[PDB]
């Protein structure tokens, strides 16, 4: 059930490898992943509350092109009507591993699978008993920002012999980054319980309390950016949010031949915040309730010279929402509040029936898994100001096929093709687009590639193909859906690791690694824009580094690097003056770190000092459509420290 045997583009990093790069936030761990692009805070998502991610040149603003899940539960506060992770109730420190799947997904996962299926694996409940705790502090000396950024995780839990267990997972953030007006406060509280009375029945549960607020720096005009890169010309922009998650799960397994699982989940999420929208400053609260019950049965049975693992599954989901918008003339110093004019009061919703079925077939050195997923989406929006009521319902057949060939006991070949569909979001109901109407978003992906492993050389490489019927943006500034039409995403994803010790003792416990990805994202639709590279899609993006482990020491050397990219569908090459429009530099950065594991016994106490961007080279990223569009100063040389304690 673990990757090397995946008939597709897949990568999964484990906890024991987050520290490697001084990583402390989802973003940072995913950006090492090939073909994955995860920009530093910028725009609406200008804070550590939101998550920005995208693969294969797909727009990574607020991850809306993917299916991100924590323990199978959907992270979003609408996975249908508002995929955008303005708020991302999730903390790296509470996870034991990140599983990013670019292709060949069980068709258990969807609908918006086209942009990859990212699932976060919350830390395992300890066997008998335990306590882990860790921290990391970061500083950007060369910034006018002196207060540092601390983060920390705490783990307490265990399992009584009666077959019951519980873990209290905690993760939180305090501090500001290298930009003024970035003061963040995050508190992610989780209560993970499990119950295995025997060996057939098992019950699991998950309760979560994520509360958070942050000051958004936002972008800069050029004048201001050169004047002082650290400063921020957006003093009103703020963002805060809290999520409450509850999930109950039970699995019936009488033998290793059949398996029944059923998971239910409820999550209430509220996110709102201050923002400056042209001579008006707005308070925008948005609540979301999301129910979901999901049963699925599996069975293994042989047929002729073939092994069959039929997987069946269902998922009913219900998402009701409420979003309002209070506003005030910026000319005043006054920030908006309740009892203040509101120009937007609505209630949207959706009821989605999904069905999926696949059949893993084994035969010789072949594993063919022909599957199909089907969704019946019904979404409605109710404007309380206009009174106008709208509705939507589309059916989405989703064929899928995976084939894996076993060349050797250490080399596999694979190929696949799965599809997706994005139901019209509540933010697109009034389909005011130039080419008729908005959505849906139908896409298909094709992957071809190989994976190799031999205990000294571990590598992979694959080619992909993604066809998009259309793609729409947002332009929060004016509240209008700028389209893009059809696009075709093609490229190659590769990475490798090696034990430079199996060549000579002198390099014993030395390891070098590198990943790379070439991505060609282009517009294929109608007019003026045809033939253009999609915005924010470096063609070239990868990493390279080395790991040395003499005794309990750990020495990490690594570099990041990426080509240039455009901000608009126009492909404008000259900076716009506000800083939004404009080609964007590529760059290569260098980072290192030194850690020691004080007596793997004692208290597994670990310490480590590391520098980020040793050369303090300069770079930046633009935000084009967000109300705070501008130049976002790139992370400068950062000195950080980590500390782990286990009991
Ligand atoms: Fe927004
Ligand atoms: Fe908006």
From Swiss-Prot:
Subcellular location: Cell outer membrane
Domain TBDR beta-barrel: 128-647
GO BP annotations listed: intracellular iron ion homeostasis; regulation of DNA-templated transcription; response to iron ion starvation; siderophore-dependent iron import into cell; signal transduction involved in regulation of gene expression
Topology in membrane: Multi-pass membrane protein
CC per GO annotation: cell outer membrane; membrane; transmembrane transporter complex
Keywords: Cell outer membrane, Ion transport, Iron, Iron transport, Membrane, Receptor, Signal, TonB box, Transmembrane, Transmembrane beta strand, Transport
GO molecular function: siderophore-iron transmembrane transporter activity; signaling receptor activity
Conditions for induction: For induction, the TonB and the ExbB proteins have to be active. Regulation by the iron level mediated by the Fur protein and induction by citrate plus iron suggest that the Fe(3+) dicitrate complex must enter the periplasm where it binds to a transmembrane protein, which regulates transcription of the fec genes directly or via a further inductor. Induced 2-fold by hydroxyurea.
Motif (TonB C-terminal box): 630-647
Principal localisation: membrane
Domain named TBDR plug: residues: 2-123
Subunit relationships: Interacts (via periplasmic N-terminus) with FecR (via periplasmic C-terminus).
Protein family (similarity comment): Belongs to the TonB-dependent receptor family.
Role, per record: FecA is the outer membrane receptor protein in the Fe(3+) dicitrate transport system.
Name by which UniProt lists this protein: Fe(3+) dicitrate transport protein FecA
Lineage: Bacteria, Pseudomonadati, Pseudomonadota, Gammaproteobacteria, Enterobacterales
């Amino acid at each position: 059930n673990d990757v090397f045997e995946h008939a597709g583009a897949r990568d999964v990093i484990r906890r024991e490898d987050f520290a490697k790069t001084g990583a402390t936030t989802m973003r940072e761990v995913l950006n090492r992943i090939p073909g994955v692009s995860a920009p530093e805070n910028n725009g609406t998502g200008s804070h550590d509350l939101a998550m920005n991610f995208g693969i294969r040149g797909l727009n990574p603003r607020l991850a809306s092109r993917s299916t991100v899940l924590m323990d199978g539960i959907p992270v979003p506060f609408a996975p249908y009507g508002q995929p955008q992770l303005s708020l991302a109730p999730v903390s790296l420190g509470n996870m034991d591993a990140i599983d990013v799947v670019r292709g060949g997904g069980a068709v258990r996962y969807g609908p918006q699978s086209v942009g990859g299926v990212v699932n976060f694996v919350t830390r395992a409940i300890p066997q008998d008993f335990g306590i882990e705790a860790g921290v990391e502090g970061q500083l950007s000396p060369t910034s006018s920002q002196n207060n540092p950024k601390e983060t920390h995780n705490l783990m307490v839990g265990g399992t009584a012999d009666n077959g019951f267990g519980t873990a209290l997972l905690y993760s939180g953030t305090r501090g500001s980054d290298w930009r003024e007006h970035s003061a963040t406060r995050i508190d992610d509280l989780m209560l993970k319980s499990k119950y295995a009375p025997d060996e057939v029945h098992t019950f699991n549960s998950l309760l979560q309390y994520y509360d958070g607020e942050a000051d958004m720096p936002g972008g800069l005009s050029r004048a201001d950016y050169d004047a002082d890169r650290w400063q921020s010309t957006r003093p009103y922009d703020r963002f805060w949010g809290r999520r409450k998650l509850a999930s109950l799960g039970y699995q019936f397994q009488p033998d290793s031949q059949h398996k029944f699982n059923i998971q239910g989940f409820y999550t209430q999420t509220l996110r709102s915040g201050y923002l400056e929208q042209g001579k008006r400053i707005t308070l925008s609260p948005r609540n979301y309730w999301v129910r979901g019950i999901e049963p699925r049965y599996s069975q293994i049975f042989m047929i002729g010279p073939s092994a069959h693992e039929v997987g069946v599954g269902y998922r009913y989901l219900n998402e009701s929402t409420h979003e309002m918008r209070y506003y005030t003339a910026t000319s005043s110093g006054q920030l908006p509040s309740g009892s203040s004019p509101y120009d937007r009061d609505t209630r949207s919703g959706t009821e989605a029936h999904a069905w999926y079925l696949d059949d893993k077939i084994d035969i010789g050195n072949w594993t063919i898994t022909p599957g199909m997923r089907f969704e019946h989406i019904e979404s409605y929006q109710n404007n309380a100001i206009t009174g106008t009521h709208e509705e939507v319902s589309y059916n989405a057949p989703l064929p899928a096929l995976n084939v894996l060939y076993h060349l050797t006991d250490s080399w596999n070949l694979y190929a696949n093709t799965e599809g997706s569909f994005g139901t019209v979001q509540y933010s697109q109901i009034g389909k005011a687009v130039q080419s008729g109407n908005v959505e849906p978003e139908k896409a298909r992906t094709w992957e071809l590639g190989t994976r190799y492993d031999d205990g000294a050389l571990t590598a992979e490489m694959g080619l992909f193909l993604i066809n998009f019927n259309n793609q729409y943006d947002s332009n929060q500034t004016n509240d209008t859906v700028t389209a893009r039409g059809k696009t075709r995403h093609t490229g190659l994803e590769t990475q490798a690791r090696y034990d430079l010790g199996t060549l000579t003792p002198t390099l014993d416990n030395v390891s070098i690694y590198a990943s790379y990805a070439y991505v060609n994202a282009e517009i294929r639709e109608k007019g003026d824009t045809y033939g253009n590279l999609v915005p924010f899609s470096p063609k070239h993006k990868g990493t390279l580094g080395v790991d040395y482990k003499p005794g309990n020491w750990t020495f990490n050397l690594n570099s990041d690097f990426q080509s240039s990219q455009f901000a608009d569908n126009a492909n404008t090459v000259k900076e716009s003056a506000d800083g939004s429009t404009g080609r964007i530099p590529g760059f290569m950065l260098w980072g290192a770190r030194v850690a020691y594991d004080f007596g793997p016994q004692m208290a597994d106490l670990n310490l480590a000092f590391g520098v980020k961007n040793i050369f303090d080279q300069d770079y930046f990223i633009r935000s084009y459509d967000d109300n705070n569009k501008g130049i976002y100063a790139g992370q400068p040389r950062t000195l950080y420290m980590q500390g782990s304690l286990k009991f």
